[PDB]
Design a protein around this ligand. Structure first.
Ligand code: OIY
Lengths: 130, 207, 122, 79, 155, 82
RNA sequence: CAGAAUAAGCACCGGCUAACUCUGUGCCAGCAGCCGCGGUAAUACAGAGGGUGCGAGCGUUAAUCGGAUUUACUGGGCGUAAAGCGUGCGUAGGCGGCUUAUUAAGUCGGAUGUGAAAUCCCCGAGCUUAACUUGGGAAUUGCAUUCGAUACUGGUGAGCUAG
RNA sequence: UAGUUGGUGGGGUAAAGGCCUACCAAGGCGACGAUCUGUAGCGGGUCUGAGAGGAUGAUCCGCCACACUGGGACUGAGACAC
């Protein structure tokens, strides 16, 4: 059964980018929307939309392609249900010598590792994007 | 221990003048066998070598001129690596700071071996006291003089006359009339010859 | 392996067996020569190579090669043995030190004298 | 100012004594995964108020018997 | 244009009444300022194989965007069963790498780098892996351009 | 009893003493309660010869610690110097 | 004060690996860490000459870690190279859909106490230099108490329907 | 596992305590490894390693244990005492 919806979302985005799709859709959740907002702010994706039919909620993401290649080149799930990963403020990972982002869930909300270091807090390392 | 024996074959093997003789007669007239290795199977300079051969041959050339053995040279490299800066220039500065080499560059000895013998036989005073260790590190603003009994030595007079032909370094201010001098600063890399390559030595010691 | 499998049962390290069991973690051993003889090499080598069966102070009986040309050993000699294989001889895992206790140094030898235990010529 | 623990009672058969199970969650030193560990502490309960299944608090004290060195403070929740 | 000869091997082909022997050569050419390429050559004799390998190397070249004299970021690359890891280093470190990586890095103009091979160390495969890693390495300007941001925003 | 005494260290023929407060039954260079200074009878040049923490010395004397003869002489000399 | 007077050996030279020839012997004598040398021109055995590396030392044996991503947490695999149980059901356990309130166990942050000295590292000091001795720092990545944060995981209450 | 696990009265100790004793109850530990068995003094540290790890516990410092092999107590502030 499905036991990691965040990993499902990341895999959907990865496969859509590899297949050169324009948009990608999934069932929605607040955590997924929070991650997508960080991606949009950092500029890896273009637009985030949430639609509601009744109790169902759908998340739609518009993908970006610059030159020939997709903008999101690498996206890796770091923390997983079988192995949770927590880091302090001094040991937050850096992706590609600061050229990528690490998505971190902290007590002040989801941010990048750069913002987490600026705020001087740690948290759970969700994913690496580059 | 210090190497004792023939210096000309040592210079020939590395393929350059190692400044191991006084210099009254040039290297070519002194040896007549340059471009030939000392062995009967000795060949020309154009013989190809491996990278391990080149690195080793550079380190041996660096050691032979200063008269330093392997243990002390390895300790020199280990200190230079620890000190912050360029490792090669640090090693060159350490080699150029030895008391015997400073005495030789002050012109009190025709060769570095003569300078070493002068230092060892207590003929040299550093900052007013008689020392006998050739490996003493000279620091900035130091004073090296010739001892009273050491003065009036024809070897010393010939040494200073021969040194007059060479150019006195910039970091050494020497009064030949009083047989005294002051080491002012460690030589920079530009002052030293550029034929010495130290990247090979650093690679060899850092493998 | 999964993380849970690693937690339940970790990784296993296999011990390495010594290639010189009779020395018993000692640089050398003393023994009594039980039988001195000659053997033939395994192919593709052919010779008559000198070996001795020795009983060690560790409680083991082994075979040890005699290096060099010309030896004065025999039964009941007391010898010192070190480690070292002979390769083409099956089952010879040790060497006999020349010129140590009863074994003598090789004769008329002037290079590599520290091996084979020959003193300086006059 | 006195060390205290919260747990659940797993035995009340003994006279004036209870066995409370304390649970903690730690990281595995090598593999990093969060695991759970359990310890059983005998505690002193003067009036036998505690029963099997309640959630209780116990504080450290001087020894009362061979195995009991903790004493009941209160019953947080009842079965 | 610096040219390095990484490897030379003698190969055999069986025919009736004997074997035909040949030579293969692998070469890496570069300009020392971010342009490098590699090639292979086969011939009955060594010099012709070397010349053909050099010609192929000059035909197959790429441009690499260095950060000074070192890499922009850590690189993981692989070709077949050969995997390579490369890491930027501070000035004075040197090229701490195996010979096959070293030729490519020096021809490309890298002066300080720490590198490692995992798996097979076959020369051609290692050269391919290092070549791919250098080709795929990115830079802050390209990252900012692709994300629609500024390099100061990227940091 | 509690004593204030000298524990020896340094090299052969060149002793260097730490001034320590300790139980008298302990070994000379072993377990101690607190170190409050040092003494170097062969100091040359810029080397310091005697440093004593007078506050800790007085505090420990007020609680019954007994200085040795050498330590008492050193304390008197340090007080005279300062 | 006297007078060069009292003071150099060891290993190696086929490739890995810096350093090559001549005699002697002829699958013998022998060498060998691995691949391998020796069966009449042996740069690989023994001697000699020459050279190379070290130097009051030089080699051999033994032992630990490394190279070994060759037990792979960092950091490996299972169609044919070693490796998916013959196939199901199911116990302990591991993991687990969406929304909301609350808690604060995991998680994160601050403060305080502690983490002996010596040792390691840094700047100095004294030894003719160095080893060595020594002043002061830094570090001791930990532990405990207490005060905070609530995104995620866990607990509790309520609700939902895509499993 | 049957003084075993807990309780009460009493004894005992410098002092808490099945430490001992008489009764009362049937408890206590264990797959988070009890019981049995092999090996081993522990730490600060030392060697190696990029690190994570691996190996180690001479000389210096702290703690523990032992004194030909076992069982005891006396004196004393302190010993079950090289
Ligand atoms: N293989 C023989 C196939 C025969 C087979 N029977 C065919 C068959 O049955 N059905 C047809 C099915 C065809 C299939 N759908 C298409 C396909 O195979 N896609 C994948 C292959 C892509 C492409 N085709 C090959 C390619 O780009 N190579 C380059 C090339 O060698 C060289 O670069 C240049 N430019 O020269 C090198 C750098 O020097 O980088 C290589 N790149 C890479 N090396 C890496 C590596 O190994 N792993 C990981 C990743 O890093 C790899 N990328």
């Amino acid at each position: 059964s499905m036991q990691d919806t965040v990993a499902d979302m990341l895999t959907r985005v990865r496969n859509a980018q590899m297949a050169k799709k324009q948009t990608v859709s999934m069932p929605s959740s607040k955590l997924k929307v929070a991650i997508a907002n960080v991606l949009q702010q950092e500029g890896y994706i273009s637009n985030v939309e949430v639609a509601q039919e009744e109790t169902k909620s759908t998340l739609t993401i518009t993908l970006k392609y610059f030159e020939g290649k997709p903008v999101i080149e690498m996206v890796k799930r770091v923390s997983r249900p079988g192995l949770r990963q927590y880091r302090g403020k001094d040991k937050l990972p850096s992706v590609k010598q600061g050229l990528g982002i690490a998505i971190v869930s902290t007590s002040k909300g989801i941010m990048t590792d750069r913002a987490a270091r600026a705020a001087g807090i740690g948290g759970e390392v969700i994913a690496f994007v580059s | 221990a210090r190497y004792i024996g023939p210096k000309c074959k040592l210079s020939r093997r590395e393929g350059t003048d190692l400044q191991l003789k006084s210099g009254v007669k040039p290297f070519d007239v002194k040896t007549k066998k340059a471009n030939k290795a000392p062995g009967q199977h000795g060949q020309a300079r154009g013989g190809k070598q491996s990278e391990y051969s080149l690195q080793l041959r550079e380190k041996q050339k660096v050691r032979r001129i200063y008269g330093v053995l392997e243990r002390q040279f390895s300790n020199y490299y280990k200190e230079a690596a620890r000190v912050k800066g360029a490792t090669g220039e640090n090693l060159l500065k350490l080699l150029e700071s030895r008391l015997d080499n400073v005495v030789y560059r002050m012109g009190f000895g025709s060769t570095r071996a003569e300078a070493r013998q002068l230092v060892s036989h207590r003929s040299i005073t550093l900052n007013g006291r008689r020392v006998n260790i050739a490996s003493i590190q000279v620091k900035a603003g130091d004073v090296i003089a010739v001892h009273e009994g050491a003065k009036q030595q024809l070897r010393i007079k010939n040494a200073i006359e021969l040194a007059a032909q060479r150019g006195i370094p910039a970091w050494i201010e020497v009064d030949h009339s009083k047989l005294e001098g002051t080491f002012k600063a460690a030589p920079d890399r530009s002052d030293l010859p550029a034929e010495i390559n130290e990247s090979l030595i650093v690679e060899l010691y850092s493998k | 392996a999964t993380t849970n499998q690693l937690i339940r049962k970790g990784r296993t390290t296999l011990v390495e067996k010594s290639k010189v069991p009779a020395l018993k973690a000692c640089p050398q051993r003393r023994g009594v020569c039980t039988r001195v003889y000659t053997t033939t090499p395994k192919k593709p080598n052919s010779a008559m190579r000198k070996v001795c069966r020795v009983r060690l102070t560790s409680g083991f009986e082994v075979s040890s090669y005699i290096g060099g040309e010309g030896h004065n050993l025999q039964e009941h000699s007391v010898v010192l043995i070190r480690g070292g294989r002979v390769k083409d001889l099956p089952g010879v895992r040790y060497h006999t030190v020349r010129g140590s206790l009863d074994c003598a140094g090789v004769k008329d030898r002037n290079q590599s004298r520290s091996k084979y235990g020959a003193k300086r010529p006059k | 100012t006195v060390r205290t623990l919260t747990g659940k009672v797993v035995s009340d058969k003994m006279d004036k004594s209870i066995v409370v199970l304390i649970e903690r969650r730690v990281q595995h030193p090598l593999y990093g995964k969060s695991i759970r560990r359990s310890t059983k502490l005998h505690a002193h309960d003067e009036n036998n108020v505690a029963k099997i299944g309640d959630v209780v608090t116990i504080k450290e004290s001087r020894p009362i018997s061979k195995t009991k060195a903790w004493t009941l403070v209160e019953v947080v929740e009842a079965a | 244009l610096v040219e390095k000869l990484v490897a030379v091997d003698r190969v055999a082909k069986v025919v009736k009444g004997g074997r035909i022997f040949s030579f293969t050569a692998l070469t890496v050419v570069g300009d020392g300022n971010g342009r490098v390429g590699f090639g292979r050559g086969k011939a009955r004799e060594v010099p012709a194989a070397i010349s053909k390998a050099l010609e192929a190397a000059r035909r197959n070249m790429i441009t690499v965007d260095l950060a000074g004299t070192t890499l922009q970021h850590p690189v993981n690359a692989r070709h077949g069963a050969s995997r390579v890891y490369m890491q930027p280093a501070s000035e004075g470190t040197g090229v701490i790498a195996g010979g096959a990586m070293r030729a490519v890095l020096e021809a490309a103009g890298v002066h300080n780098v720490l590198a490692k091979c995992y798996g097979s160390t076959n020369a051609a495969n290692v050269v391919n892996a290092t070549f791919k890693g250098l080709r795929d390495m990115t830079s802050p300007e390209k990252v900012a351009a692709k994300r629609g941001k500024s390099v100061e925003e990227i940091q | 009893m509690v004593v204030i005494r000298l524990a020896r260290g340094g090299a052969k023929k060149r002793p260097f003493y730490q001034i320590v407060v300790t139980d008298s039954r302990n070994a000379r260079d072993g377990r101690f309660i607190e170190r409050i200074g040092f003494f170097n009878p062969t100091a040359q040049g810029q080397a310091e010869k005697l440093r004593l923490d007078a506050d800790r010395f007085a505090h420990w004397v007020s609680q019954g610690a007994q200085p040795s003869e050498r330590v008492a002489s050193l304390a008197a000399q340090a007080k005279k110097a300062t």
